[PDB]
Symmetry: C2
Subunit: 36 residues, 2 copies
């Protein structure tokens, strides 16, 4: 949600990287309400 | 592009986090060609 996403080091597996994408796009959509 | 994005530690400033979003969505769009 509007929280910092867990960083699985330097190389995350693409599934969890997609999960990271979810949390990241959500976080950014919150802190910066603009479409990217 | 289709390369691993630079991780600015655990907390990145939202501008560079948006840049990270660009590289990340590009990377994911390459490795996993599906809309998210």
């Amino acid at each position: 949600g509007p929280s910092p996403p867990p960083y699985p080091g330097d190389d995350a597996p693409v599934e969890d990287l997609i999960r990271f994408y979810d949390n990241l796009q959500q976080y950014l959509n919150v802190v910066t309400r603009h479409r990217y």
